Every structure is written in C-alpha cells, then in structure tokens.
Amino acid sequence: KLSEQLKHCNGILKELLSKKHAAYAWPFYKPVDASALGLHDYHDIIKHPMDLSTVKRKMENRDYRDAQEFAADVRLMFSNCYKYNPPDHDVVAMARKLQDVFEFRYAKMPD
Numbered sequence: 001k002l003s004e005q006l007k008h009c010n011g012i013l014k015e016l017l018s019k020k021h022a023a024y025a026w027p028f029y030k031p032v033d034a035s036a037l038g039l040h041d042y043h044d045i046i047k048h049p050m051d052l053s054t055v056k057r058k059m060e061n062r063d064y065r066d067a068q069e070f071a072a073d074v075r076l077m078f079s080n081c082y083k084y085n086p087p088d089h090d091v092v093a094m095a096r097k098l099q100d101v102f103e104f105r106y107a108k109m110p111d
C-alpha cells in the first residue's frame with residue numbers, strides 16, 4: 001500500500017508520537033481545542049487547523065499523494081502555532097523542538 005518514501009514518512013509519524021519526545025510533542029497530538037483553552041479568535045486566525053492525529057488519520061486512510069504532501073501538513077501544524085502565538089510562548093518553544101526532530105528525519109528520506 002505504501003511507497004518507500006511514504007513508509008519513511010509513517011516512520012517519522014511514529015517517531016513524533018513516541019514517548020521519547022512527549023515532553024514537547026504533546027500539544028500537537030490532538031487538535032487545538034480553542035474553546036477549552038479560551039482562544040476565542042483561534043479559528044478566525046488559523047484557517048486550516050492541523051495536528052498529528054489528523055496526519056495519522058490521513059496516513060491510515062492512504063490520503064497522502066506523496067511525501068511532499070505529508071511534509072506540507074506537518075509544516076502547516078508548526079506554522080499555525082508560529083502564526084497564532086507570540087515568539088516567546090512556551091508552545092512555540094515546543095513546536096521548534098519537535099520541528100527539529102521532524103526536519104532532521106525528513107531530510108534522511110530515501111531517494
């Protein structure tokens with residue numbers, strides 16, 4: 001069902017949800033619950049929410065055309081966090097740490 005490149009991507013997904021990175025990955029596991037957090041303007045500012053559970057749903061449903069589309073969704077997750085938050089926010093620090101893991105593994109993708 002999966003190309004060599006999308007298997008590599010599924011392995012990155014597994015890595016990003018693994019306990020090793022939980023200290024900083026956890027705000028990305030589920031969709032941002034704007035009402036529960038009191039972020040009443042989140043969905044006015046962030047037009048296309050993304051999180052690791054959405055990515056995992058897509059991967060399980062074979063919805064990614066290619067590894068580039070997978071990378072676009074993971075990068076959107078991070079970009080939404082940088083767009084909504086100020087630069088010194090604790091969740092932005094977490095996003096940068098998780099994104100370092102993502103980009104490094106993504107770069108080792110096979111030809």
Ligand SMILES: COc1cc(OC)c2c(=O)[nH]c(-c3cc(C)c(OCCN4CCCC4)c(C)c3)nc2c1
Binds near residue numbers: 028037038089091
């Ligand atoms: C638990 O998982 C997540 C995941 C997240 O993204 C992946 C976010 C995220 O993007 N932003 C925030 C967030 C941001 C701000 C500015 C904030 O403060 C509003 C009121 N403050 C007092 C008055 C001035 C501002 C609050 C409470 C939460 N929380 C998240 C939690």
